[PDB]
Amino acid sequence: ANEVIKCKAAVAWEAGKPLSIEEIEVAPPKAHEVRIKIIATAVCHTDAYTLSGADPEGCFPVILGHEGAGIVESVGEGVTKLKAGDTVIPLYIPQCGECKFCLNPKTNLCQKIRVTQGKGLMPDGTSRFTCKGKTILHYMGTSTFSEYTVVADISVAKIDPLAPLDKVCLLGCGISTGYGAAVNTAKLEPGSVCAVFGLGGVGLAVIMGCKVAGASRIIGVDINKDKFARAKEFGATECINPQDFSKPIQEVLIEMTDGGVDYSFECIGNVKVMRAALEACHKGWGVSVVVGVAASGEEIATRPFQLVTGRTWKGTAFGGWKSVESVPKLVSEYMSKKIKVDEFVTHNLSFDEINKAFELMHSGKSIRTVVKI
Amino acid sequence: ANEVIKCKAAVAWEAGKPLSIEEIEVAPPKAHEVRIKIIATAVCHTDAYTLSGADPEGCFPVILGHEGAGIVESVGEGVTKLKAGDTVIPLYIPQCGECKFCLNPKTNLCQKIRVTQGKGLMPDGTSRFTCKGKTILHYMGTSTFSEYTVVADISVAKIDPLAPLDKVCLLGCGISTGYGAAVNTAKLEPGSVCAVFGLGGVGLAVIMGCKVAGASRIIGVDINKDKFARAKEFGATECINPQDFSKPIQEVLIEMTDGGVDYSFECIGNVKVMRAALEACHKGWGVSVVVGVAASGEEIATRPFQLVTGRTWKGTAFGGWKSVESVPKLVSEYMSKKIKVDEFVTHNLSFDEINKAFELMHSGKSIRTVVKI
Numbered sequence: 250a251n252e253v254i255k256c257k258a259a260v261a262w263e264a265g266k267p268l269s270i271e272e273i274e275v276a277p278p279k280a281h282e283v284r285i286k287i288i289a290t291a292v293c294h295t296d297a298y299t300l301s302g303a304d305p306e307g308c309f310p311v312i313l314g315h316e317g318a319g320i321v322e323s324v325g326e327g328v329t330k331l332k333a334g335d336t337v338i339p340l341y342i343p344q345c346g347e348c349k350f351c352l353n354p355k356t357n358l359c360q361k362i363r364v365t366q367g368k369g370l371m372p373d374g375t376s377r378f379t380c381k382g383k384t385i386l387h388y389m390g391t392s393t394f395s396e397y398t399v400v401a402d403i404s405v406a407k408i409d410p411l412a413p414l415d416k417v418c419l420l421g422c423g424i425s426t427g428y429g430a431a432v433n434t435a436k437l438e439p440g441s442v443c444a445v446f447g448l449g450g451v452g453l454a455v456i457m458g459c460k461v462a463g464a465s466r467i468i469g470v471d472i473n474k475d476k477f478a479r480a481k482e483f484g485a486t487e488c489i490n491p492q493d494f495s496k497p498i499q500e501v502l503i504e505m506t507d508g509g510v511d512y513s514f515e516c517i518g519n520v521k522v523m524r525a526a527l528e529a530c531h532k533g534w535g536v537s538v539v540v541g542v543a544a545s546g547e548e549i550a551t552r553p554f555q556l557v558t559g560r561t562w563k564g565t566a567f568g569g570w571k572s573v574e575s576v577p578k579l580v581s582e583y584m585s586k587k588i589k590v591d592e593f594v595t596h597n598l599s600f601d602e603i604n605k606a607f608e609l610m611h612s613g614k615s616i617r618t619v620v621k622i
Numbered sequence: 623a624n625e626v627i628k629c630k631a632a633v634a635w636e637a638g639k640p641l642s643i644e645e646i647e648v649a650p651p652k653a654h655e656v657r658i659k660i661i662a663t664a665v666c667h668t669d670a671y672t673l674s675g676a677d678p679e680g681c682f683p684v685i686l687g688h689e690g691a692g693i694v695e696s697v698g699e700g701v702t703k704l705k706a707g708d709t710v711i712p713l714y715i716p717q718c719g720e721c722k723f724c725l726n727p728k729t730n731l732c733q734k735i736r737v738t739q740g741k742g743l744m745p746d747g748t749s750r751f752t753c754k755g756k757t758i759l760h761y762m763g764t765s766t767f768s769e770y771t772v773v774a775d776i777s778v779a780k781i782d783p784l785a786p787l788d789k790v791c792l793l794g795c796g797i798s799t800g801y802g803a804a805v806n807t808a809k810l811e812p813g814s815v816c817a818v819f820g821l822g823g824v825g826l827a828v829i830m831g832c833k834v835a836g837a838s839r840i841i842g843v844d845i846n847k848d849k850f851a852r853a854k855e856f857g858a859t860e861c862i863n864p865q866d867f868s869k870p871i872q873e874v875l876i877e878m879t880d881g882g883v884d885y886s887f888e889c890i891g892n893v894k895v896m897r898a899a900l901e902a903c904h905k906g907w908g909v910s911v912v913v914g915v916a917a918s919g920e921e922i923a924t925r926p927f928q929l930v931t932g933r934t935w936k937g938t939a940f941g942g943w944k945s946v947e948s949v950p951k952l953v954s955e956y957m958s959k960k961i962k963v964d965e966f967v968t969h970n971l972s973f974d975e976i977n978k979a980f981e982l983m984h985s986g987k988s989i990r991t992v993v994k995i
């Protein structure tokens with residue numbers, strides 16, 4: 250492309266300050282990039298973190314957002330997999346397909362863009378987001394909170410065009426992560442007992458995952474009781490509340506399964522609940538997965554005896570999926586009714602009232618606020 | 623059997639006090655037990671712990687020892703797998719073959735005798751070791767520091783009779799553990815980089831394991847430099863000393879492999895070196911195994927990011943081997959020259975001078991002191 254699209258966007262000028270809708274100048278695709286016309290974007294706890302200012306590495310001003318879905322407005326020099334009009338989903342973990350991590354089947358962490366993406370710039374150390382002369386930094390390689398964005402050649406996952414754009418976008422984060430957390434990482438086995446700590450979005454995708462995997466007793470765990478209904482609806486055979494007892498939560502779970510759960514996923518991001526989750530697993534074979542990100546400096550811990558008695562401690566990023574190859578498939582899984590997606594959108598908003606989304610989040614009302622652009 | 627054998631043994635009357643050779647009355651086999659004539663027994667750091675008195679659960683007086691090998695003096699009512707004259711090796715982890723843990727291929731932790739063994743008694747809550755009227759408690763189900771011992775039906779692994787009894791006994795502990803730590807637990811893959819923290823006995827069996835497994839760069843790590851020669855002899859391509867640098871050991875290992883080791887085993891039993899080992903593994907797929915037992919209350923820890931970036935934390939008991947089925951096979955592996963064993967015996971002693979073994983241990987001179995009974 251050549252022309253400079255001027256459009257609407259939700260810039261975040263200074264941390265701690267509400268996203269100000271703004272007009273911006275989205276430059277045209279440089280070699281191996283694609284400009285995407287957003288059609289829907291949701292809000293995640295992740296976006297909240299950066300805006301919160303607590304993100305130690307959160308440069309501003311930045312056009313946040315990563316759960317998006319849209320049409321390709323145009324491609325840059327040297328691109329071939331995409332074309333103007335293709336229905337896509339940007340991704341925050343690329344799949345260059347030729348790096349040390351992309352060539353290995355044990356991980357999905359493509360490093361080819363790690364450092365440039367980190368500095369809120371494109372693969373050439375520059376941004377495409379101009380505004381009133383000032384330079385706005387891209388965010389997580391996606392920058393969905395914009396009518397038009399510019400992502401690198403390798404961050405796009407082309408998808409089914411008849412895919413409800415205002416829904417499939419939840420596959421660029423929460424859903425996938427939790428689905429893979431049960432399907433990829435843990436590689437859960439039919440008939441196994443499980444326990445899910447944290448019944449928000451990510452947690453729900455895990456309960457879903459355990460089900461399609463064919464579990465036999467998924468146990469949801471959350472402090473806020475309101476989360477219980479959808480949990481049980483999604484597959485959870487039971488739901489308990491830590492606050493409801495005097496014994497430590499691990500001691501409760503154990504008694505309930507005479508030994509411990511076979512698998513256990515921590516989807517909150519609370520170190521104290523992380524070691525709690527691990528210690529609730531069964532002796533000799535219990536496995537624990539960390540799906541929730543944590544605060545800088547917070548560190549997990551436990552007595553090594555746990556691991557010596559036979560307990561594996563694992564973690565996961567984007568549920569394991571090699572982005573570009575997987576996302577497209579997940580959409581099929583959706584269309585063919587194998588997995589749920591709409592069930593996650595608890596609220597719809599209009600672009601103008603973007604800030605409202607960050608508002609319902611702070612109240613434990615939402616599972617995923619979807620915003621029409 | 624019926625007669626009460628009166629013989630020599632090394633009783634430990636009170637913690638902190640040197641093992642006093644003594645005459646004792648070893649009662650005859652009760653149903654489903656076997657009396658074993660010891661012919662050789664070695665000394666392990668484990669035995670030191672109990673005697674040290676620091677073992678929170680170390681009831682006295684006790685006839686310690688677990689690395690033994692001998693001939694079956696006689697069997698008790700209801701036994702059939704053994705007979706007077708069979709060459710055997712007692713084990714501290716049984717294989718009842720029908721419990722919740724024995725029936726599952728993910729672990730080797732037979733629980734059928736856990737509580738009784740713990741109280742230093744036989745499966746019927748009584749001991750076979752009488753002495754000057756007093757009751758001496760059995761230790762780890764084996765009690766090898768005795769001319770004659772009594773172990774339960776399920777703690778015996780029948781072996782190759784032409785097996786050098788004064789050597790194969792090292793398979794009842796250190797060797798197996800470390801071999802399996804690389805072969806079973808980690809299931810190491812041909813061509814992989816590795817790092818071994820602690821070059822004592824257990825550590826050496828891991829270096830051995832990584833080799834037969836077909837590694838590609840085993841890195842030994844120890845504080846005491848004297849351990850380096852045998853390490854390199856066993857398979858280690860290089861050996862480094864933590865104390866030799868100013869950077870944290872993890873930071874050193876990383877630079878040496880441009881990323882990290884693929885696998886990493888901690889064989890010391892030092893929590894600080896445990897998180898150190900884990901953090902030295904490679905991003906996205908690195909795996910860490912805890913083979914070393916630790917002090918009561920000491921707890922491992924790290925930032926969850928490690929696990930989220932793709933790092934598995936594992937632990938192991940007896941290297942994974944389902945005792946009774948495996949031990950016999952390991953002996954074959956020995957005889958058929960597939961694995962080393964003699965290379966571990968750095969000192970031979972006579973029963974009378976048993977205490978000397980605990981002495982060389984306290985000096986980092988030994989890898990395994992073998993004692994002829």
Ligand SMILES: NC(=O)c1ccc[n+]([C@@H]2O[C@H](COP(=O)([O-])OP(=O)(O)OC[C@H]3O[C@@H](n4cnc5c(N)ncnc54)[C@H](O)[C@@H]3O)[C@@H](O)[C@H]2O)c1
Nearest residue numbers: 447448449450451471472473516517518540541542566567
């Ligand atoms: N590792 C990754 O790749 C990855 C990817 C996406 C999201 N995440 C992270 O996963 C975590 C989950 O995010 P989310 O999107 O699901 O939404 P969320 O914030 O809505 O989920 C929060 C849930 O945890 C519950 N909770 C809080 N304290 C609890 C406690 N002490 N015990 C039990 N439950 C408790 C809250 O009540 C709520 O139910 C976050 O840390 C997010 O950053 C990680």
Ligand SMILES: NC(=O)c1ccc[n+]([C@@H]2O[C@H](COP(=O)([O-])OP(=O)(O)OC[C@H]3O[C@@H](n4cnc5c(N)ncnc54)[C@H](O)[C@@H]3O)[C@@H](O)[C@H]2O)c1
Nearest residue numbers: 820821822823824844845846889890891913914915939940
């Ligand atoms: N998990 C199990 O099933 C199992 C089984 C058998 C033994 N073990 C345990 O494994 C561990 C190893 O025992 P061992 O028999 O091999 O003999 P050991 O005591 O001789 O090995 C000690 C080695 O660790 C080294 N070391 C000490 N501090 C170090 C440090 N800070 N950094 C690097 N190296 C250091 C010592 O110098 C020595 O080389 C012990 O804890 C033992 O109890 C565990």
Ligand SMILES: [Zn+2]
Nearest residue numbers: 293295422423
């Ligand atoms: Zn998100």
Ligand SMILES: [Zn+2]
Nearest residue numbers: 345348351359
């Ligand atoms: Zn890549």
Ligand SMILES: [Zn+2]
Nearest residue numbers: 666668795796
């Ligand atoms: Zn031992």
Ligand SMILES: [Zn+2]
Nearest residue numbers: 718721724732
């Ligand atoms: Zn058993």
